[PDB]
């Protein structure tokens, strides 16, 4: 309150005579040229030596050190001159023109008196009151020093002794005009104290003060004086000062003088002298009082006449902040400031100190980013010509430092307040607020500066970092409310249903596990948010565009809040499955989508392989396992509407059935459903792929196995086009098999995955065989019956240079009469098949069809029932009536007309696989037996037949043999000594004498030129008997041992009678090449027994029945024991 009233009655007074009515003293240098006096003191002006200042405007005449002590304007001190000079009534007439100078301020700016009044609230009265009190103040007070004077008589000290006491009795009297007063009395002292004030009136500076110090006598001599003297009281001295020495207030001692001549004077006196033409001494340091002004000002304005709204000034230029208000205010707080010099500076810091209380009032913050960067340039550069720093100028702050720095800081820390909630204080939808937020980081970067400049400080928090802050903060603000309210917000921004748009349960305002569309929601609220920061406030917010990308913060801090929140969502999906595994799908579409475009550029993550789809790969497997399932079963029905079809060839040429297509087409729109992921993880694809390569697998096996099963029904001969067909098929998997892994990235694909399918690939490759054989194998009945046919056919053939001319009928006749049974059916069937099967098919057909053919004819027709089974059986013995050079001819035409047949051209099997087939090759070879020389033949018996040693069928006794295989010592051929030792068990209990001896024979090879017998001397009446006699038997040189046997046999003499047969032995002499020689029991068999091979030479020996070697042979092999004086059957 003090303050204020005190402020209101400087401010009337400031204002009522305003400083602005005042003029200048033009002053010359003058010299009084003869004795003068100063219109100011009085003093003497006196030549060069003490020369005065003359104005022209006022005129007037005074010392230098006097020419400012004139202190009233120039129209006044124009007055006074020309009341020193003569014309005393231009006084009054400026007198006047101090009263005019009043009416007209006021008549012409009531309202700077009136918003006095209202800007310290005072009534129209009351102010009309202090108004005749600040008019008098400067109207009764338009020339005066009516001086009131308050002299106190403080003390005396050294004083003159006059008393009845011996010392004084000392008062004072003081006078001042005509008008005298007097101390009472200090009594018996010389140094007295009285501390007495008189007060006084004085009208002139030019006056004097009379103090005047007496002995109070109180005695008859006093009372007589009192006759005679003014002065009863015995004087003790006096001072006398003129009131222009004085001010203020005074204490000064004087020293003291005569006066009366009653006189005698000593010491001094100490007066204290106030002197009232002092007046607002009282000032608050006008700093206080201007700001106590302006404060009352501002609220007046902002809240009083602005209802807390802040009109910004009827200010010019930066300068704004120095023009605080419109011209009214502008004026008082400038008057105020003039009249009491209040620098600019410190009327700015009081306006900024205001305006803090207001910061948040439209365009505000650009006047306080001005004000500031003007109070920062004050303290930071006007001025800085003084070598003090900014922060310590600021500091001699009349305002004072801190408080300026407090108040800062506040609206600093307010500033980073609403900036961390940017949006929600700055909506992209003001504009306004947009740009009161650009000043605002306008007034932030001032601040900053300010710390930096006029603080000094080094490190204060960098204005980028700190709205940074704010900004993380209100886009984490942001996130937290969008994923905790997504239903509310993406409800009333966007739901494509208004019955959406409200509070929607919390478990689908953050997530659901019944449903995708939270997620579908949430990312359209991102989307939408990094478009407003990226589209407003990225522009809004450009004072640091280098540090500064609003749309990019966004998009980091809102993707990696989210990418969490969905990663827990797809795991928690997965534990319930409650959406379909399409809605995972068309979701991993939005999300690979959202991230491909906001996430995947910012650096953070296209640093990255996408973690995303380690999401959704569980929903995918899902998905590849509903998709095989339906594969598998859409498998058999495909399967089973194409056997409804009797499995018909898609066309006569397209030579597989429909549903390979149906599989193959399913098999690509599933795996084309897997590919439109392009999961950029290529191990969850990898992971996807093994998934599929095992569908894949599954369902081919069980194609290639329902094929398989149904295969063999199909064999037989008259549906022949249906097993093509499925070979075809089965080939068909392979072929589009080997297509569709080049599909799933060929050699590229994942190892595993390609390892199932290269698993799959080989075991479809090996049920193809088994297919081609089980087929091949249903024609067997017919081809061996056929070939039986042409084996009967072929029997009408013989040797034919020993035959007539129907059976030397040609070699192609024979040939095509014989071949007729199966070209038959061979031209049909492979020409069909050549049709219908495809070549890999047909290949393996052909190759079982071929080499069941060749074992065929080489069975049934070249070592044929129509010939062994005659030789080794009851029947004849035969010849087949030779098989000469004519059925080797006929056969071989035969053969090559077959494997003409079989090659068709290279459209069946190669012709080298045909010439080096061992189907073929070892027909060939047994034809050639049929041809050969009869030695050879025999070797090859003698080889075969090893077994004829080992093991005899009912012996009918024994031999002992030492028998030596001498290589011989007189010409190298092989020797055979043959000791005959003796018999043994011999079962010949005969009716005549028994007379036994030992026949041995040699067979072998190359045995027409050489004994192939002896025999020993006979013993009577003994069935043990011995001979001890030895026999010398010559092999070929050119066959080894091994190509040779002893063939024993004992024997009965009989002369003039005949020798009877006992019993047969072989003894190989493969067993006497490695023994050189042995001693041996060798049991006596009724026959010797044969092999195949014994037999099929046998068969081809037999054939040579004209040959005497092949005669013999025939004859020793086929020789054999009586069954008379023996008993029992021999066996095979």
């Known amino acids: 309150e003090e303050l204020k009233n005190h402020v209101y009655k400087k401010t009337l007074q400031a204002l009522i005579y305003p400083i602005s009515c005042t003029t200048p003293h033009n002053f010359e240098v003058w010299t009084a040229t003869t004795p003068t006096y100063c219109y100011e003191c009085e003093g003497l002006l006196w030549g060069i030596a003490r020369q005065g200042m003359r104005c022209t405007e006022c005129g007037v005449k005074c010392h230098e050190k006097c020419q400012d002590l004139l202190n009233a304007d120039c129209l006044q001190r124009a007055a006074e001159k020309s009341s020193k000079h003569g014309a005393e009534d231009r006084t009054q007439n400026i007198i006047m023109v101090l009263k005019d100078r009043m009416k007209i301020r006021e008549r012409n700016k009531p309202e700077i008196f009136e918003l006095i009044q209202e800007v310290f609230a005072v009534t129209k009265s009351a102010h009309t009151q202090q108004m005749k009190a600040v008019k008098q103040s400067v109207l009764d007070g338009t020339s005066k020093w009516s001086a009131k004077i308050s002299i106190t008589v403080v003390c005396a000290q050294g004083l003159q002794a006059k008393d009845k006491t011996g010392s004084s009795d000392p008062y004072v009297t003081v006078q001042v005009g005509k008008t005298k007063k007097r101390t009472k009395t200090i009594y018996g002292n010389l140094n007295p104290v009285w501390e007495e004030n008189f007060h006084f009136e004085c009208h002139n500076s030019s006056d004097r003060i009379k103090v005047r110090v007496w002995d109070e006598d109180d005695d008859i001599k006093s009372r007589v004086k009192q006759r005679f003297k003014r002065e009863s009281d015995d004087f003790l001295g006096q001072t006398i000062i003129e009131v222009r020495t004085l001010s203020g207030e005074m204490d000064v001692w004087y020293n003291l003088d005569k006066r009366t001549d009653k006189s005698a004077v000593s010491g001094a006196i100490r007066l204290h002298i106030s002197v009232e033409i002092k007046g607002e001494e009282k000032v608050a340091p006008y700093h206080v009082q201007y700001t106590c002004l302006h404060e009352n000002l501002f609220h007046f304005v902002t809240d009083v006449q602005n209802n807390g709204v802040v009109k910004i000034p009827d200010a010019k230029g930066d300068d704004a902040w120095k023009v605080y208000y419109d011209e009214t205010a502008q004026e008082i707080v400038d008057e105020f400031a003039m009249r009491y010099g209040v620098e600019s500076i410190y009327q700015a810091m009081t306006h900024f100190a205001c305006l803090s209380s207001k910061y948040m009032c439209p365009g505000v913050p650009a006047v306080m980013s001005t004000l500031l960067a003007n109070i920062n340039a004050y303290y930071a550069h006007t001025t800085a010509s003084t070598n003090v720093s900014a922060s310590d100028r600021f500091a001699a702050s009349n305002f004072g430092k801190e408080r300026f720095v407090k108040l800062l800081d506040q609206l600093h820390n307010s500033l980073r307040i609403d900036l961390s909630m940017y949006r929600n204080n700055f909506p992209a939808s003001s504009p306004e607020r947009l740009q009161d937020l650009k000043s605002t980081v306008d007034l932030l970067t001032s601040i900053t500066f300010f710390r930096m400049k006029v603080q000094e400080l080094q490190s204060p928090p960098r204005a980028s970092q700190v709205v940074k802050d704010c900004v993380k903060a209100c886009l984490n603000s942001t996130y937290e409310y969008i994923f905790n309210n997504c239903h509310e917000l993406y409800g009333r921004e966007y739901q494509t249903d208004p019955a959406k748009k409200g509070e929607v349960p919390p478990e689908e305002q953050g997530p659901s596990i019944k449903n995708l569309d939270f997620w579908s929601k949430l990312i359209t609220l991102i989307v939408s948010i990094i478009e407003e920061d990226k589209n407003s406030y990225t522009p809004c917010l450009n004072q640091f565009p280098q540090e500064l990308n609003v749309g990019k913060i966004s998009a980091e801090v809102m993707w990696s809040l989210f990418a969490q929140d969905m990663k827990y969502a797809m795991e928690e999906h997965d534990k319930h499955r409650l959406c379909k595994s399409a809605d995972y799908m068309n979701l991993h579409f939005k999300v690979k989508w959202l991230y491909n475009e906001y996430v995947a550029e910012l650096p953070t993550f296209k640093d990255r392989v996408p973690e995303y789809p380690a999401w959704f790969e569980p929903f995918v497997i899902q998905w590849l396992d509903e ?126 995955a390609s390892g199932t399918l290269k698993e799959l690939q080989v075991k479809l490759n090996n049920v193809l065989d088994e297919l081609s054989h089980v087929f091949a194998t249903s024609f067997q009945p017919h081809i061996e019956e056929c070939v039986r046919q042409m084996g009967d056919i072929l029997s009408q053939v013989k040797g034919t240079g020993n035959v007539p001319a129907s059976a030397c009928s040609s070699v192609a006749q024979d040939a095509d009469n014989v071949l007729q049974p199966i070209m038959d059916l061979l031209d049909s069937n492979l020409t069909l098949f050549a049709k219908i099967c495809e070549k890999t098919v047909l290949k393996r057909v052909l190759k079982e069809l071929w080499k069941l053919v060749m074992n065929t004819m080489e069975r049934t027709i070249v070592l044929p029932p129509e010939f062994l089974s005659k030789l080794k059986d009851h029947m004849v013995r035969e010849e087949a009536k030779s098989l000469t050079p004519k059925q080797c001819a006929v056969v071989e035409l035969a053969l090559d007309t077959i494997k003409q047949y079989f090659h068709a051209g290279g459209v069946g099997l190669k012709k080298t696989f045909l010439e080096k087939s061992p189907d073929l090759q070892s027909l060939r070879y047994a034809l050639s037996l049929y041809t050969q020389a009869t030695d050879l033949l025999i070797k090859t018996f003698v080889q075969t037949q090893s077994a004829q040693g080992s093991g005899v069928e009912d012996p009918v006794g024994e031999v002992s043999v030492h028998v030596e295989l001498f290589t011989h010592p007189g010409t190298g051929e092989q020797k055979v000594t043959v000791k005959v030792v003796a018999a043994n068990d011999l079962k010949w209990q005969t009716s005549g004498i028994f007379r036994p001896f030992i026949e041995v024979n040699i067979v072998g090879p190359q045995l027409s030129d050489k004994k192939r017998k002896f025999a020993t001397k006979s013993k009577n009446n003994s069935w043990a008997p011995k001979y001890n006699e030895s026999f010398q038997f010559s092999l070929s040189a050119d066959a080894g041992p091994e190509c040779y046997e002893l063939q024993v046999c004992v024997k009965d003499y009989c002369f003039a009678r005949e020798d009877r047969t006992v019993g047969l032995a072989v003894l190989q002499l493969r067993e006497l090449a490695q023994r050189g020689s042995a001693a041996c029991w060798l049991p006596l068999g009724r026959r010797i027994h044969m092999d195949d091979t014994g037999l099929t030479v046998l068969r081809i020996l037999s054939q040579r029945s004209n040959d005497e070697v092949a005669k013999e042979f025939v004859k020793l092999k086929s020789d054999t024991r009586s069954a008379e004086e023996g008993g029992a059957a021999p066996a095979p």
């Not at 599954?698 to 037989?716: G, H």
């Open 627 to 752: 998709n095989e399932e339906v594969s598998r079963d859409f498998l058999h029905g495909a399967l089973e509407r194409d056997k409804k079809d009797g499995f018909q060839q898609t066309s006569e040429h397209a030579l597989f059935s429909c549903s390979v297509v149906d599989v193959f087409s399913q098999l690509n729109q599933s795996f084309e459903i897997i590919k439109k992921l392009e999961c950029p993880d290529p191990q969850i694809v990898g992971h996807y792929m093994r998934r599929f390569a095992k569908t894949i697998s599954n369902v081919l096996l069980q194609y290639a196995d329902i094929v398989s099963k149904d295969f063999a029904s199909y064999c037989s001969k008259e549906k022949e086009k249906v097993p093509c067909i499925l070979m075809n098929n089965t080939q068909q998997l392979r072929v589009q098999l080997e297509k569709m892994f080049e599909a799933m990235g060929g050699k590229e694909l994942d190892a595993e």
